[PDB]
Amino acid sequence: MVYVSNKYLTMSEMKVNAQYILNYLSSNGWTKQAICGMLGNMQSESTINPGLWQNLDEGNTSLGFGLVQWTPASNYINWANSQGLPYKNMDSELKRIIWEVNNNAQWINLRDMTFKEYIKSTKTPRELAMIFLASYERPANPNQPERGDQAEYWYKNLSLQLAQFPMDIINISQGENGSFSHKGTLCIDFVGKTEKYPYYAPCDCTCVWRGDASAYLAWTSDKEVMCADGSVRYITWVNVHESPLPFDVGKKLKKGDLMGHTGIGGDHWHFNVIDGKEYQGWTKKPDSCLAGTELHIYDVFAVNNVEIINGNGYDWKTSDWQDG
């Protein structure tokens, strides 16, 4: 959903557009600050409307058009045609801006910042709105602090999850460095209240590997998460012993969705988590665990609303972090 028209948008309609642009350019590696600094500008140029002609003068290609009011409009519209993109279109316009960053276009460095620098900046959305104004837009009237106020407003009004321990109970049958099969590892075997006991997604995640032989699924958090130890990081983990395996590679789960059950794939759940967003298969040291940097389960996942029955004397922590 985007609002595209030759008419001034209300704040409700702009908010929808502003959210869309945030989502799109976020995936393209721009910072929330720089996107909002641009939004403050596009609010003044266009009410964040990709279909808007300057002064509502439809079809006048000598005047401004679209989100940043490309002037003359034909420079953009012609670029769009050459690129096989429909010109009056949100994504096409965002693709034009990305192109300008990638091709040393539009921007003039008047504030000791290049366009490539701009999109990675974490200066205030106010600061960056004014940098954008001076460098990209270059208006005849430079005194427009409202673009800054608008930037900071979109920063606050648009758009971390706390990693929650998957299961309702903690009851450890074999901890980190356990003698039977965890020597050298930070793995933990957990049992449920019964056989085949459910556990849930600690955060939005995706299934990245399936080992049918060894009965494991591997998962990677979609975003960086907030950990029980106050760390912010991507995480990757493995669930072993479920039978049959619930999902396939690519499967997407939201925080709290059913992720698996204990099993015999004695009934239990072997769990192991590493730092980062890269699954790297396995190693033995001397016992089997994930390759990569193992993290303590009790430092990563919070135990809010978990019944601890055993325990193993680990620093299990609750967290007051509130999910975005």
| Residues involved in catalysis | 45
Q: By CB under 5 A, tell whether 93 contacts Zn ion.
A: no
The answer to whether 31 and 140 are in contact (CB under 8 A) is no
Q: By CB under 5 A, tell whether 176 contacts Zn ion.
A: no
Any binding-site annotation on 182?
yes
Span near Zn ion by CB under 5 A; candidates 1-9, 87-95, 149-157, 185-193:
185-193
Burial degree of 267 (CB within 10 A; 0-12, 13-18, 19+) = middle
Span near Zn ion by CB under 5 A; candidates 5-13, 17-25, 129-137, 188-196:
188-196
Q: By CB under 5 A, tell whether 241 contacts Zn ion.
A: no
Q: Output 9 or 187, the one with its CB closest to Zn ion.
A: 187
Partners of 189 in the β-ladder: 174, 270
The residue from 189, 242, 294, 299 that contacts Zn ion (CB under 5 A) is: 189
* Distance of closest approach, residue 171 Cβ to Zn ion, in angstroms: 14
Q: Output 255 or 270, the one with its CB closest to Zn ion.
A: 270
* Distance of closest approach, residue 182 Cβ to Zn ion, in angstroms: 6
Q: Output 75 or 181, the one with its CB closest to Zn ion.
A: 181
Largest CA distance in the chain: 77
User: What tokens appear for 213 in the block?
Assistant: 């032989």
Q: What is the spatial distance between Cα 176 and Cα 184, in angstroms, rounded to a whole number?
A: 8
Q: What is the spatial distance between Cα 280 and Cα 283, in angstroms, rounded to a whole number?
A: 9
* Distance of closest approach, residue 194 Cβ to Zn ion, in angstroms: 19
Q: Which has the closest alpha carbon to 262: 240, 286, 290?
A: 240
The answer to whether 174 and 65 are in contact (CB under 8 A) is no
Is residue 269 helix, strand or coil? strand
Q: Which parts of 259-318 interact with Zn ion (CB under 5 A)?
A: 270
Tell me whether strands 216-221 and 288-290 are parallel, antiparallel or unpaired. Answer: unpaired
Q: Which residues bind Zn ion (CB under 5 A)?
A: 187, 189, 270
**Could you tell me which residues are annotated as the binding site for substrate?**
45, 71, 106, 137-140
